[PDB]
Structures are given as structure tokens and as C-alpha cells.
Design a protein around this ligand. Structure first.
Ligand SMILES: O=C(O)[C@]1(O)C[C@H](CP(=O)(O)O)[C@@H](O)[C@H](O)C1
Ligand SMILES: [Zn+2]
Length: 352
């Protein structure tokens, strides 16, 4: 399945197939050079996977830190300086091969190399069905996740759906949180429909019918990003449950999806607190348990530290904290949420 961003100028493809890993080479030699940034663990896993195209005269393998441990200022310099020492050109390409983390990083590298070079997204996780589309790249700060980065359109995205066969459950759950989020955004139908298909752990864990809920996720985003690339309003909707989520992920150091799920239920808690959309909290809470989500850190949360982090959030203004709330499937709204709600929603979410 091939897709394409419908922007005015410079648009990119997105190959979502079970052999998409082949679509790499139709580019490699049309670039003076190519630098393959690959996660340190992904590199072990798929040792020869990328020899068919790496044993070339242009391609060089660059091994960065595993996941979120690469998204730092320090690594940014090293990797860039290392790269440049190869007398590159403005027509070089950066091939990201790994999770969302190696993707954000390689992307921020590519986006700033000689003021911008070529970028090829090659996701290998479920969560990266999300992170590889939209052009958002970057690293982390001492203040929070993704606080330095940029909007840079990749030349093309290549999502080989065969990489899911090696994903551990902890990452299925993690990636599933984004597949589920796009669903919540797709309406009461798509939610209860995906909730109906992926009923419990064993279903998810098996991954049957996943190939479908991913393509549906990618599409759903491709729409919000083409329609509002610079997050000038609507794209703020992909941030569903990330306000609290990003705070739990950074401070509690738990997987992105896991935090997002917890960020989701908390968001409903607020949508009650304010609009009183009367959300079935007991429903969502349970559905997560079945799927197999941990929920052990729920008790170790801490409104105080999370709140201060929540002030770094990229959606706020001078007025204070800001969240993406759901009032009804098809009625998502963004707005201020003073410490009040955040004081009694982190405690009502503790009720569980
Ligand atoms: O607009 C996007 O691409 C996102 O909102 C981007 C966020 C990252 P941000 O909140 O740091 O921009 C990502 O976590 C989410 O899954 C999708
Ligand atoms: Zn996310």
C-alpha cells in the first residue's frame, strides 16, 4: 500500500507493505551519499537485513544509542560531526531504521545537516506508524520530551510490515496506544470496533488484524498533518492524552504508549471534570487491563512534579496549562485546565 501527502509542493510517499524494505534502493543511488542511522539494538536484530543495500560505496552505517537514549544534545553533536567528517553534500540522505526515537533523532540530524539534506523514514515498530509521518523530529531537553527539533518533511517513508513479527509484547502495547488513539479520534464506531477486534491480551499479542488497524492509523494522521502541518490548530488533536502522558513518560520513564494510555484515561477524567461528557472510566480502565497494560505506576504518580513539567508542554500559552479533551466522539476540544482539574483528576485517576 502506497500513500502520498497532499501538500502543495514537495510531497512524500509512504510505503506500507510486508516487503517495503526493498523500496530503499530505488533512492540510494540518486544521492551522492547515504548515512544509515540505526538503533544499537535494531542493528543486532537485523544484522544482514540491510546488507543488500549497505555493502555499497555510498552507504555508511551509523550506530546511535538505543531508542530514547540517543535523543540528547550530546549525541546530536557527535553524530553530526562524525557524519560531516565525510565531506558530504546537500544531496546526501539519512536513512532512519528503528523506533520513533531513532526516527526523531535521525530526522533532526537530517533536518539540520548543511541546513537540510534528504530524509528516508524506515520504521520498525508499531508506534512508528505514528512517529514516522508528519515530519516532527527532534531531541529531548532536561525540561522534557521533544523540546528542540523541527518540522522536516521526509523524502519518503518505508514501513515494512514484516518488522512487527519481532516485536515483544511490551512494544505491542506501547505501539497499540497510538493505533488506539487514532481510533478514539476516528469516532465512537472505530473505537468500539477496534475494541471489539482487539478484545484482550492474546488477540493483541497475536497481532491478527493489526496490519489493517495500522494502515487506518497512518491514513488518519496523514490527514491531520497535511491539513495542519505546523500544528496550527487541528493537529493539536494527535496530542490526545499526551499532556499528562509526556509528563509520566519523562518523569516515570515508562514506554510512550503505556504513558499515553494512562494519559488517555486521565484526559477522559478531565472531560468529565469540566464538560461532564460522563465518560465510562470503569470501561477504559478495564479494557486496558485485559489488553495487558501494567498500571503499576498509577499509584506512584505525583501531581506536583508532573504539573511543573506540564508547564513546559508545547501546547500551552501564557495563560497556563492546556489539554486536548474529548467531550464526545467527534467533539475534541483544546483549552485551559488550571491546576484544579489537574489536582482532582490525578487523584480520581488514583481511585484506580
Ligand atoms: O502531531 C504529531 O505528530 C504528534 O502529536 C507528535 C507528538 C510529539 P509532541 O507532542 O512532542 O509534538 C507524538 O507523541 C504524537 O503521537 C503525534
Ligand atoms: Zn505519541
Amino acid at each position: 500500500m502506497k500513500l502520498q501527502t497532499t501538500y502543495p509542493s514537495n510531497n512524500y510517499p509512504i510505503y506500507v507493505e510486508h516487503g517495503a524494505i526493498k523500496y530503499i534502493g530505488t533512492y540510494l543511488n540518486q544521492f551522492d551519499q547515504s548515512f544509515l542511522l540505526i538503533d544499537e539494538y535494531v542493528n543486532q536484530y537485523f544484522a544482514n537485513k540491510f546488507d543488500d543495500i549497505l555493502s555499497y560505496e555510498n552507504v555508511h552505517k551509523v550506530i546511535i544509542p538505543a531508542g530514547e537514549k540517543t535523543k540528547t544534545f550530546e549525541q546530536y553533536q557527535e553524530t553530526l560531526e562524525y557524519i560531516l567528517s565525510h565531506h558530504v553534500t546537500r544531496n546526501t540522505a539519512i536513512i532512519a531504521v528503528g523506533g520513533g526515537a531513532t526516527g526523531d533523532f535521525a530526522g533532526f540530524v537530517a533536518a539540520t545537516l548543511l541546513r537540510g539534506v534528504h530524509f528516508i523514514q524506515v520504521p520498525t515498530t508499531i508506534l512508528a506508524h505514528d512517529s514516522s509521518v508528519g515530519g516532527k523530529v527532534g531531541i529531548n531537553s532536561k525540561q522534557g520530551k521533544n523540546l528542540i527539533g523541527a518540522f522536516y518533511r521526509p523524502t519518503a517513508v518505508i514501513y515494512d510490515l514484516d518488522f512487527l513479527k519481532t516485536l515483544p509484547f511490551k512494544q505491542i502495547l506501547s505501539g497499540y496506544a497510538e493505533v488506539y488513539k487514532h481510533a478514539l479520534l476516528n469516532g465512537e464506531s472505530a473505537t468500539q470496533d477496534i475494541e471489539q477486534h482487539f478484545k484482550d491480551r492474546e488477540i493483541l499479542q497475536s497481532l491478527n488484524g493489526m496490519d489493517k488497524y495500522i494502515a487506518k492509523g497512518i491514513e488518519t494522521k496523514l490527514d491531520i498533518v497535511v491539513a495542519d502541518e505546523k500544528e496550527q490548530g487541528v493537529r493539536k488533536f494527535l496530542n490526545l492524552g499526551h499532556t499528562f502522558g509526556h509528563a509520566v513518560e519523562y518523569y516515570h520513564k515508562i514506554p510512550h504508549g503505556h504513558a499515553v494510555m494512562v494519559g488517555i484515561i486521565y484526559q477522559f477524567i478531565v472531560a468529565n471534570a469540566l464538560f461532564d461528557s460522563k465518560h465510562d472510566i470503569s470501561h477504559y480502565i478495564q479494557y486496558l487491563i485485559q489488553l495487558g497494560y501494567p498500571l503499576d505506576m498509577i499509584t506512584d504518580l505525583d501531581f506536583e512534579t508532573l504539573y511543573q513539567y506540564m508547564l513546559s508542554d508545547k501546547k500551552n500559552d501564557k495563560q497556563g496549562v492546556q489539554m486536548v479533551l474529548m467531550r464526545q466522539f467527534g467533539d475534541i476540544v483544546v483549552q485551559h485546565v488550571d491546576q484544579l482539574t489537574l489536582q482532582h483528576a490525578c487523584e480520581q485517576l488514583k481511585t484506580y
